[PDB]
Write a protein that binds this ligand. Structure first.
Ligand SMILES: [Mg+2]
Ligand SMILES: [Zn+2]
Ligand SMILES: [Zn+2]
Lengths: 331, 330
């Protein structure tokens, strides 16, 4: 009965040169200090965002997985690696290259470290190919971004991808990215605080209200990050709209709240009360422990929030261990 | 007693009276022969179908009797903001609407009270208009968090709040639609996603910019629709403030400390969500709002509060207490 944290990130050892072979303006790459303790994700010549050793160093990662008490970690690509705006073939190469890095990262000790794969989601055919290929090679599932430009999960291209995954029994983690807002949310990390949970909610409602869950096989294992954003809280607002407006009701047959039996969320909500509403809405079976390691905005003491909760001992075990062992079939 | 502090009206404006300001941007009210329906018209195009309750105080009174609702605070439909029009035309528009709300109210000023609207695109015009209208009998103001082309929180908006803080003008802040552009086209998603989020953004903008430090605690200000997702996501904000010096930069106390500087209405449509809202705002800072008459307003006004596991003093505060002191209503 170990701790399994199923939402962490990594960034591969890519040089400006190798990145430039893909796109000297848009391919992210990794610059490490000469010491080797600090580092920066770089976009072309520009500095994207400063980072640290646990993101790229698998040996170093463990030592922190030890002091935190985490026994198995699922990790996946930092969202800046997605490449959804690039040209299909170039992106398909990129995903493959990235997914091999993830295996090299993982293979250092593939018992405590599982990976998820990225896919050229702008191109359905290549995206399925990469998903299958990658899982067959070791990955325990896929992580995708919650939208693709003006396409939300209700889009047929994205509904088809989910359907491929269900049929192939490949678990998906859905991550918000490329946040809405435009020029309204520069300061104070507002995009992490306002737009990310809104993106996630939108993803979730898009599946539910479009009807998608009626068409997508119940075998689909799908998980949303950040506790489903602000979903659980505004659900009542949503049922109410379904109950009193035909246009909200058109493509959605059952009341939206019944659909929480079709997906999973992570536990990253940062507040005991918020976590108790979340479990209430989702059930102890559908909530998995996620940290967002090693980003500053993640919980510094992984598992801490759940562990301190006024929750059943069985509930805690599930969220901390049980649910992801099933979901990702880690054993 | 029982107060509804969140609701709307629209005026009996003809196409021609509208035409004066604009015959294609100023909205007007079309009414059927069997005056039970009709709709808000923009130019000559149907803008939105509208039930008789949205005008006619008489009819509303009778619905206010069915619904056990003793007093109602009602303000403009966001359509008639016009925070995009030229500063002066919008001040003249603002002027008229605020009179319309006064004739609407002069049909039962015990049971019907109104807030005014401002030409927020111009600080002075908006300031003056505000002072005038409360003096005219409006119990306060409703503003959006937007202008249509605004960025939601700058030193300008802060200045306005300060004016109202000083002249004791109470404020209801009401959310905008457009955040997600060419997305959210179906299922009323702007109402379900964009609006909650806008409202959380308005709140967090006051808190993280440090505005509450520079604003007189006499500021009386309420956020619509439960504060959007604010209460549920507050944990996330505190965590950021604690681990990112940039979040902390202009915010000297943890953001959750500032909940004593503002109010929220209770429309969260769910008992579990209402308990959490209360746990965060405290029973003293949540008021009963229905968003009547709109289809997405609560249908049985008060029902979620009345039917809850809150205390009994708690319920009297939400139903009655808070709104009495907030607006000054006895
Ligand atoms: Mg589309
Ligand atoms: Zn993440
Ligand atoms: Zn409203």
């Amino acid at each position: 009965k170990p701790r399994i944290d199923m939402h962490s990130h990594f960034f591969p050892r890519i040089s400006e040169q190798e990145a430039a072979k893909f796109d000297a303006n848009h391919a992210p790459w990794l610059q490490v200090s000469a010491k080797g303790d600090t580092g920066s994700i770089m976009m072309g010549k520009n500095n994207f965002r400063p980072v640290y050793q646990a993101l790229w160093d698998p040996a170093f990662r463990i030592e922190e997985m030890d002091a935190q008490g985490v026994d198995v970690q699922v990790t996946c690509a930092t969202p800046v690696m997605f490449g959804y705006t690039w040209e299909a073939n170039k992106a398909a190469q990129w995903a493959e290259r990235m997914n091999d890095f993830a295996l090299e990262f993982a293979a250092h000790n593939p018992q405590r470290i599982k990976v998820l794969a990225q896919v050229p989601l702008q191109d359905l055919d290549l995206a399925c190919k990469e998903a299958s290929r990658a899982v067959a090679a070791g990955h325990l599932g896929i992580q995708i971004g919650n939208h693709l430009g003006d396409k939300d999960l209700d889009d047929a291209t994205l509904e088809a991808f989910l359907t491929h995954c269900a049929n192939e029994d490949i678990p998906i983690l859905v991550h918000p990215w490329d946040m809405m807002g435009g020029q309204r949310m520069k300061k104070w990390m507002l995009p992490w605080l306002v737009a990310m949970p809104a993106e996630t909610q939108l993803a979730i409602l898009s599946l539910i209200l479009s009807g998608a869950f009626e068409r997508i096989p119940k075998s689909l294992k799908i998980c949303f990050g950040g506790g489903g954003g602000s979903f659980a809280f505004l659900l009542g607002r949503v049922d109410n709209a379904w109950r009193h407006r035909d246009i909200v009701r058109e493509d959605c047959p059952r009341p939206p709240s019944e659909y929480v039996d079709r997906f999973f969320v992570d536990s990253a909500v940062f507040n005991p009360g918020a976590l108790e509403l979340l479990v209430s809405v989702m059930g102890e079976d559908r909530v998995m422990l996620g940290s967002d390691y090693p980003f500053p905005l993640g919980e510094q003491k992984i598992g801490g929030l759940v562990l301190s909760s006024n929750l059943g001992e069985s509930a805690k075990d599930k969220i901390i261990s049980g649910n992801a062992s099933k979901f990702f079939n880690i054993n």
